[PDB]
Design a binder for these strands. Structure first.
Ligand SMILES: [Mg+2]
Ligand SMILES: [Mg+2]
Ligand SMILES: [Mg+2]
Ligand SMILES: [Mg+2]
Lengths: 49, 97, 834
RNA sequence: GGCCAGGUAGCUCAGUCGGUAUGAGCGUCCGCCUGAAAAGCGGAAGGUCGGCGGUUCGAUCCCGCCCCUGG
């Protein structure tokens, strides 16, 4: 739920993967693992990464 | 440390000692005594400061060509010994892993 | 970017309009702001000063010459018949200026006691103070010059300067742009303290100015995302007028320098209401003002006299002559207010938040206006903020407000800026908070923050106010109820977590490997993914080496380290150099982390809509576009493997120590590995083993190549090992040992083989021929003496035979030994020692 | 983004705006010494003075670009 072109996302300075606009980066948090677990596992989920 | 006779003498003394070194450890000794700060070719560049200003451009040019001669012979000799070392590590230091 | 600074006195004043007499300590105010969600980065009190600190007027200036710097002997009127002679080094003041004087006996911030001094051959009876010396501001170049009429000579300096005030430095989260002003912060305090709030932007506080016609011709392209564009002129302002001290001081305490009334009022109103304002010199406008996207390759010079390259996504204000402003970022120097400006046209506009964000970030202009527009500015208060500016500017600079107004509000004009209503159950905040809130708490709190609440049985219909575009879903409303009621009331109950499966086999193996290596003498590090500069050039790898295919970072902290690690050794060797270079020369390190091994160029995937679950094919596509990231275990060794002591001088690191590190990892993983000779940089090609689990390669180990050691500044004889843990299968063996009660037979067999024959191959040949009677085999001698031919070696194994059902004879054991020798002769060409 | 100040031996730091950094402390090596050590005393090695170019007979020093710091 990060808003695009917004200080909630732009001010989150990130190691972006070259070239520019690759939509690939080094994760600023392990939160994308929580997205993968919700897509992979069945409910209920009680997970730690 | 003046005439080209004194420069060619030190270059040949440095060049023949460079061609004599067969191991990398020996070439390190030659680098100290023939290219280091206490070497004859280094003392020739140190004497360029006590020379009159009108003579630094002429004498300094003869020192650079002499230093580049011994420096070029050192680099090619260092590459030759490094090439021999790299080609000999397989057999001369092989073990049963 | 999220900083907001304001003095407590100003904040208290706005709150006190609807809560007369309201006043709290700075300590309590900080806790209240923290309790409702506003980070207080710093609480900076002003001053303090003590003793005679008074307002003075410079009555004369004598220039003391002949010194290292210009020095002034000043006669200062402090309100009595005896003027004071004060030596001052500053030069930013003239005769007749109002200054702040610290007389002998006064105390300035920091225990600086003031007394008479004998400076520059003169007697100084005090000092003229700077803003920094009074702890009022950061200005230390010159001394503080109060604007004319601010006070009379003799007035108490602390009272005039308001040194009892306190400045609050707040970090505002990007969802609360309305708090980027005294208006929003005062409203928050009215909610937290259950007070009546009088909106400083309401018509009662800013009564509407007359509307008798258009103020300026205007063409607006609605595709630019502009929501409102209002203009009102102020004619006949005095170019000599200065902003009063109360206005210059509040700007100062908020971190804005005063310049001229026209600009000071626009900045003041922006701080007060949150609506950025801008003042144009109307006499420098040529024709119709136009709001449109910039064209390809269009440029403009901004307020600071710097030319900017514009994009077709940038919104501009132009006329018939040039560009007047970069919409929502900064105005241009063309229509900029100057010292001789007499007729001002004020700009009150609402820009698209995303458009301003892209433009200010591309141009690196985080101005006060831009960082407010990108967090959404309340579009309903435009004309209110406009009328506030026009009335205040005309009053200060002796101008006159023109009764004309242009107010573009879209096609068709929008006369109601209410967001869409939200439906939410009355007890939804109660469920998420886990607290049974009192009756009507949700509706009361939502009404406090400005929303319209209507009841429909148990379902609330909530319409958030125009200054709260962050309130879009019921969850947003839940946060408002919970934060105002306080998160401290939420109880602590542990959730019903089901019967979990615990650690996976891979996570359990990762621990066992770490425990084993640490118990064997290795020290774990945390490897960095950024490779050292030119590490593969030092290793002498070929240009087509797969380890060179690395993923590169666009914005690394070091421009010479952009590539991600395809191997763990460069990070381990870097930590190995750090230890050895600092006196710890006998070191053994290991690391267990992932690598980044791309199989193609950097290929991205377009945005998948987040209003739905991605399909299983879309999830697989996102995974395939990512580089392979297997988990590796690696280790490096140098110096002594075993330290010296009362037993002996210790043993240096050798290649066999790295080979044993493989078997330590293999035993921890409960897999069987084989080591085979291989050539693989950066290892020593004659002391390099390739590790196999079955017939699958999992890594290498041994001594590093001496040329790599030289070019990398490593210790001589440094050894290393790197394994691919993902390439090693997780095993779950179930042994069923059968212990035989019968005695064993011990025999030794000596075999002569070629030098190149691996000792393991000889043992495998002996094992294959001996049969099931062979219980254990162990090599204990390798002899290459003179009685052994050149390029040959003698190997002697200790054999242990035992039958499961009988006692053997020496002939029975010798039959298996002779069968083992025949197998060794057939498989590795062994000859029985003789 | 500014003019500045910096990056110097294995570690921590001095110092030089053209021909030797006589660099320091500690680290490394040799000798006397000890059964073997260390200290002590006496000897040495090691920097390509951040990188890539340019100017010059010659650059740690001058000029340009760039990398990484402090303010
Ligand atoms: Mg925080
Ligand atoms: Mg919220
Ligand atoms: Mg250092
Ligand atoms: Mg000694």
């Amino acid at each position: 739920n990060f808003p695009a072109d917004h200080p909630a996302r732009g001010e989150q300075d990130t190691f972006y993967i070259a070239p520019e606009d690759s939509r690939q980066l080094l994760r600023t948090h392990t939160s994308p693992v929580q997205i993968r677990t919700l897509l992979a596992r069945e409910l209920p989920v009680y997970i730690i990464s | 440390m003046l005439s080209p006779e004194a420069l060619t003498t030190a270059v040949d003394a440095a060049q023949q000692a460079i061609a004599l070194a067969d191991t990398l450890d020996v070439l390190a000794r030659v680098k100290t005594e023939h290219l280091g700060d206490r070497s004859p070719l280094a003392l020739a560049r140190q004497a360029l400061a006590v020379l009159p200003k009108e003579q630094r451009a002429e004498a300094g040019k003869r020192v650079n060509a002499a230093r580049n001669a011994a420096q070029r012979s050192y680099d090619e000799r260092l590459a030759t010994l490094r090439a021999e070392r790299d080609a000999a590590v397989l057999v001369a230091e092989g073990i049963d892993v | 970017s999220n900083a907001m600074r304001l003095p407590y006195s100003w904040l208290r004043e706005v709150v006190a309009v609807g809560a007369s007499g309201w006043d709290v300590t700075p300590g309590e105010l900080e806790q209240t702001l923290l309790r409702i969600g506003h980070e207080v980065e710093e609480v900076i009190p002003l001053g303090p000063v003590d003793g005679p600190v008074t307002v003075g007027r410079v009555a004369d200036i004598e220039e003391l010459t002949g010194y290292k710097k210009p020095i002034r002997a000043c006669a200062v009127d402090i309100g009595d018949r005896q003027y004071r002679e004060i030596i001052c080094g500053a030069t930013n003041f003239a005769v007749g200026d109002l200054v702040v004087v610290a007389l002998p006996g006064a105390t300035l911030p920091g225990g600086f006691t003031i007394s008479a001094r004998k400076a520059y051959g003169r007697n100084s009876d005090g000092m003229i103070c700077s803003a920094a010396e009074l702890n009022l501001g950061a200005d230390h170049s010159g001394i503080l010059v109060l604007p004319p009429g601010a006070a009379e000579p003799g007035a108490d300096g602390a009272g005039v300067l308001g040194l009892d005030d306190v400045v609050f430095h707040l970090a505002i989260t990007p969802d609360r742009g309305y708090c980027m002003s005294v208006r929003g912060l005062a409203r928050e305090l009215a909610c937290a303290y259950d007070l009546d709030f009088v909106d400083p932007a309401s018509n009662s506080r800013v009564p509407p100015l007359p509307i008798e016609g258009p103020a300026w011709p205007l063409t607006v392209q609605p595709e630019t995302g502009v929501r409102r564009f209002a203009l009102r002129p102020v004619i006949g302002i005095d170019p000599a007028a200065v902003s009063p001290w109360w206005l210059q001081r509040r700007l100062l305490l908020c971190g804005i320098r005063a310049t001229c009334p026209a600009v000071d009022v626009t900045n003041y109103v922006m701080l007060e209401l949150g609506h950025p304002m801008h003042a144009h010199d109307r006499n420098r406008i040529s024709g119709t003002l136009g709001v449109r996207f910039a064209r390809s390759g269009e440029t403009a010079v901004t307020l600071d006299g710097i030319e900017r390259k514009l994009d077709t996504a940038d919104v501009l204000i132009v006329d018939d002559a040039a560009t007047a402003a970069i919409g929502g970022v900064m105005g241009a120097a063309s229509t900029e207010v100057r010292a001789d400006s007499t007729d001002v046209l004020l700009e009150a506009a609402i820009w698209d938040p995303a458009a301003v964000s892209r433009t200010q970030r591309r141009l690196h202009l985080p101005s006060e206006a831009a960082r407010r527009y990108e967090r959404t500015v309340d579009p309903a208060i435009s004309v209110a903020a406009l009328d506030r500016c026009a009335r205040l500017l005309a009053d200060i600079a002796g101008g006159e407000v023109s009764p004309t107004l242009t107010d573009w509000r879209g096609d068709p004009p929008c006369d109601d800026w209410s967001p869409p209503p939200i439906r939410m159950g009355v007890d939804v905040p109660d469920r998420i908070a886990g607290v049974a809130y009192p009756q009507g708490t949700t509706a009361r709190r939502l009404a406090q923050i400005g929303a319209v609440v209507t009841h429909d049985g148990d379902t609330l219909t909530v319409t958030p106010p125009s200054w709260r575009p962050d309130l879009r879903q019921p969850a947003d409303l839940v946060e408002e109820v919970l934060r105002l009621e306080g998160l401290e009331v939420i109880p602590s109950v542990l959730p019903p977590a089901p019967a979990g499966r615990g650690l996976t086999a891979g996570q359990q193996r990762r621990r066992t490997i770490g425990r084993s290596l640490a118990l064997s003498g290795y020290v774990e590090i945390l490897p960095t993914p950024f490779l050292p500069a030119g590490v593969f050039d030092l290793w002498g790898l070929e240009a087509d080496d797969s380890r060179r295919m690395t993923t590169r970072v666009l914005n690394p902290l070091e421009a010479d380290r952009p590539q991600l690690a395809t191997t763990l050794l460069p990070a381990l060797l870097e930590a190995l150099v750090r230890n050895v270079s600092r006196g710890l020369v006998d070191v053994a390190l290991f690391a267990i982390a992932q690598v980044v091994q791309p199989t193609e160029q950097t290929r991205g995937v377009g945005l998948i809509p987040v209003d739905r679950r991605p399909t299983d094919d879309e999830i697989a596509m996102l995974d395939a576009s990512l580089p392979r990231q297997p988990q590796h275990v690696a280790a490096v060794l140098a110096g002594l493997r075993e330290p010296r002591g009362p037993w002996g001088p210790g043993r240096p690191v050798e290649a066999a120590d790295a080979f044993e590190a493989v078997r330590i990892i293999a035993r921890a993983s409960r897999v069987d590995v084989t080591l085979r000779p291989a050539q693989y940089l950066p290892w020593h090609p004659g002391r390099c083993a390739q590790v196999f689990v079955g017939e699958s390669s999992v890594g290498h180990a041994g001594q590093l190549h001496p040329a790599v050691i030289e070019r990398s500044g490593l210790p001589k004889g440094t050894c290393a090992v790197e394994l691919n843990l993902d390439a090693i299968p997780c095993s779950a063996p179930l042994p069923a040992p059968r212990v035989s009660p019968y005695p064993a037979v011990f025999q030794d067999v000596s075999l002569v083989v070629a030098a190149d024959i691996p000792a393991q191959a000889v043992a495998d040949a002996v094992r294959a021929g001996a049969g099931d009677l062979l219980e254990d085999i162990a090599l204990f001698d390798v002899f290459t003496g003179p009685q052994i031919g050149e390029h040959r070696k003698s190997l002697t194994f200790a054999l242990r035979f035992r039958a499961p059902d009988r006692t053997l004879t020496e002939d029975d054991a010798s039959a298996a030994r002779d069968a083992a020798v025949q197998s060794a002769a057939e498989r590795v060409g062994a000859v029985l020692r003789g």
